[PDB]
Specification:
By secondary structure, the chain is of the alpha+beta class. It has a single domain, classed as PAS domain (Beta-Lactamase, 2-Layer Sandwich), CATH 3.30.450. It is built from four helices and five strands. Strand 1 and strand 2 form a beta hairpin.
Length: about 140
């Protein structure tokens, strides 16, 4: 005879999955991903010190591993629906709240040209480079 109902609200209950990456670590570069979201390659900029390992990132997920907490249809659904057709076109900016303070970053994803690969650019929200060149595969 378990008929004990309980209805209440707790701010702590709703407030969960906070920022875990206390570290800042600033960097801007592109990363190759697969249809499933697996790291294929890593290409960072040539104007800063080395941070994360190039091989350590490979084999793991980008938004499912490197980006813990983004596991949702808010950012995943867009990637899935895009893969189903073979061309994920998304352009927006994400806010990365840290202990040191809030930091917004612009990320642009687009299907690779060679095919069977995706291109995800990650860099702080700021217009710097737009017209590139000398980028042709062998």
């Amino acid at each position: 005879m378990e008929h004990v109902a309980f209805g209440s609200e707790d701010i702590e209950n709703t407030l969960a999955k906070m920022d875990d990456g206390q570290l800042d670590g600033l960097a801007f570069g592109a990363i190759q991903l697969d249809g499933d979201g697996n790291i294929l390659q890593y290409n960072a900029a040539e104007g800063d010190i080395t941070g994360r390992d190039p091989k350590q990132v490979i084999g793991k997920n980008f938004f499912k591993d490197v980006a813990p907490g983004t596991d949702s249809p808010e950012f995943y659904g867009k990637f899935k629906e895009g893969v189903a057709s073979g061309n994920l076109n998304t352009m927006f900016e994400w806010m990365i709240p840290t202990s040191r303070g809030p930091t917004k970053v612009k990320v642009h994803m687009k299907k690779a040209l060679s095919g069977d690969s995706y291109w995800v650019f990650v860099k702080r929200v700021k217009l710097a480079a737009a017209l590139e060149h000398h980028h042709h595969h062998h």
